Structures are given as structure tokens and as C-alpha cells.
Amino acid sequence: MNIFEMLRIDQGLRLKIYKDTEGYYTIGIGHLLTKSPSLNAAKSELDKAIGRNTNGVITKDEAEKLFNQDVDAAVRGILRNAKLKPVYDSLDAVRRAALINMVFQMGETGVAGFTNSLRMLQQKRWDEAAVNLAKSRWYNQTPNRAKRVITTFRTGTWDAYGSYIDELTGLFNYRYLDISLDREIKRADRFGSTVSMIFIDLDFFKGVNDTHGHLVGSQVLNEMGMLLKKSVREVDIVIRYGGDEFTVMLVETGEKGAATVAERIRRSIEGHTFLAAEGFNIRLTASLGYACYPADTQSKLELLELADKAMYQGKEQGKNCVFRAT
Ligand SMILES: Nc1nc2c(ncn2[C@@H]2O[C@H](CO)[C@@H](O)[C@H]2O)c(=O)[nH]1
Ligand SMILES: [Mg+2]
């Protein structure tokens, strides 16, 4: 965990322009391009910011450079702010990340208005700072993010963000499904775009544990996570759940893209030899099901239900297959 991954959890990563909660054109890890209603003005600013003719689309490397520029500007502003500089200078690196996080969300002036919280932070009175931080419009507006940021100030650890990471595979875990889904569905609702969910369940995975032992099976799941990430884009969200069950949430594409990605995943699993560098010859297939929002449903919960039912239909009809919700 680090400040990039922390803000990616809180703000997502997007490689095409989207609209934030106020309707403002944004890209990357929460980089506001403009408040202008003009998409053209947003694209002209994006080209200046990246230093390329982007037509509204950037690479992950570009988004992370833009993010680092935004962190540097937040720190330089903190250091020029008489109320924030002494607190920042006094904090350790993790708690500085929490302060920067607040500046990303609400701006420097907003953070500087946390008079009593800042006092307690400068005095290392962590529990009192956490109580004071929650007495704010910020906490009420975004309580889940504020609780994470507050826990980071209270503890000085990354644990509130690490609890979204699956230890075995390094993928996101089931706790991230709520956050990521709610966020990309809302962004799609504002923008008129599509979100698709793909459920993937390995076929006969118990047979790997039976033949090679559970430690080998766990390494197969780790390699499966790597293969899924290689098969999708950096804006797509890959989660493990549980056991040999994974989800992929597709962002920034449509129904045709969902079909293409699900078929690519199925084919890539079927063609892959697992643990080959360790001398194994493990072969697997998977059953996949997917559904698209808003085409197939206008309920996020139903979207999950339909993709899972489509996957199970594949399981019942021979496995090694992809079904879209009917
Ligand atoms: N090796 C291994 N097997 C698992 C893990 N999680 C679930 N499983 C097994 O995968 C099978 C899925 O049906 C079940 O027997 C689970 O016990 C894991 O982390 N490692
Ligand atoms: Mg299975």
C-alpha cells in the first residue's frame, strides 16, 4: 500500500474523461480538468496537462504522472499554508498521506478549516483528533472514505486500505466490490455509459488441491490473478472472493467489449499452463457469466445476480464457456 493505491481506492482510476459528483470533467485519479460545461475545453486542458494530443484518453503511466504532479502541488500548497505546514511537518509519512488525501477530496482551504483536528494531530493526540475529524460535513457526506482516512490518522498504518486487498493474490477482495461497484455505477448513471460484471469460477479447481496439495492450489490462484490482470485493462477491477471465484468489472467499454473480454479470459485460461516455470503441467478451464448495465438491468444488485446466474448456467451446461445473462 502507498499513496497512489490509497487514492485509487478512494477515487478510482479512469483513463477516459468522466464526470464527478458535480458534473465536472475529470480523469485519472480524481484529476479535475475544468468546471466548464464544455467537453472540448476539458479535452484541450487534458492535452496541455499530458503534453500530447489525447482526444480524451490517457495511459496508466500518464495518469500516474498526473497524480504525482497533483501530490506535489498539494504538498507545496500545504507547505505555504500557515495552518497546515506545522501539522504536516510534524506528521509521519503515512499520516501525511492522509492529510494529502483530504486535500485531494476537499481542497486546501477546506482542510485548513479543521481547527481542532489539526491541533490534536500536531500534538500527536490521535484518538482526540479522530473524534474531532468526524464532527464535520465531510464525514457526513462521505462517511466511508472519511472513516478510512480517520483510521489512518488514528493508527499511522495503512490497515484501513489493506483490508481491501486479498493477501494471497494481491487482487482486491470482496470488501472492494461494494465500493468499486457503487462508484462506477454512479459515474455511468451521470455519463450515460455502461458497466459490465463478469463472474469467473475455475472448473474442477478442487482437483488441483487433490493432485498437488493446497499450497500448489494457492499458487495457481495467485497465477490466475496475474493472468486475469494481463487479460484486462488497468481501469478494470479484478477481485478475488472467494476460493476460486473472481469478478472483473469492466469500465470504459460497452456490451461488445464485455463479450470480447470474457471470451479472451476464457481462451487465455484454457490455453495457459499453470506453474510452468516451476515444472508443473497444470491445465484448467473456467466458466464465465456476465451482464451489462444498464442494458440488462438498472439495479446494481440485480447486475451481480444476473452475471452469477449466467456463470452457473455455464457450469451446468458443460463448463469452459461464457454466457451473458439472458
Ligand atoms: N488451495 C486453495 N484452495 C482454496 C482456497 N480457497 C478456497 N479453496 C478451495 O477451492 C475449492 C473451491 O470449491 C474448495 O475446496 C476450497 O476449499 C485457497 O486459498 N487455496
Ligand atoms: Mg470452481
Author numbering: -162 to 163
Direct quotes from the study:
The hybrid promiscuous (Hypr) GGDEF enzyme GSU1658 (renamed GacA for GMP-AMP cyclase) was hypothesized to regulate a new signaling pathway through activation of cGAMP-specific GEMM-Ib riboswitches in Geobacter sulfurreducens, an environmental bacterium known for its unique ability to perform extracellular electron transfer and accelerate bioremediation of subsurface contaminants. GacA has an N-terminal CheY-like receiver domain and a C-terminal GGDEF domain. In this work, we show for the first time that GacA specifically affects cGAMP levels and cGAMP riboswitch transcripts in G. sulfurreducens and is important during bacterial growth on particulate acceptors, such as mineral Fe(III) oxides.
To gain insight into the molecular basis for function and mechanism of this signaling enzyme, we pursued structural characterization of the GacA GGDEF domain from Geobacter metallireducens in the presence of GTP, and obtained a 1.4 Å resolution x-ray crystal structure as an N-terminal fusion with T4 lysozyme. The GacA GGDEF domain has a βααββαβαβ global topology that positions one guanosine substrate above the signature [G/A/S]G[D/E]E[F/Y] motif and can be overlaid with a canonical GGDEF domain with an RMSD value of 1.152 Å. Electron density for three guanine nucleotides was found in the GacA structure, two in nucleotide-interacting regions that are conserved in other GGDEF domains. One guanine nucleotide is bound near the canonical allosteric inhibitory site (I-site) and the second nucleotide is bound in the active site above the GGDEF motif. The final guanosine nucleotide binds at the T4 lysozyme-GGDEF interface and may act to stabilize the construct in a way that ATP cannot. Our structure of the Hypr GGDEF domain with bound guanosine plus PPi shows that two specific hydrogen-bonding interactions are made with the nucleobase, a Watson-Crick interaction with Ser348 and a sugar-face interaction with Asn339. In particular, a magnesium ion coordinates to the β and γ phosphates and is held in place by the side chain of Asp374 in the GGDEF motif. To interact with serine, which is a shorter side chain than aspartate, the guanosine shifts toward the α2 helix in the Hypr GGDEF compared to GTP in the canonical structure.
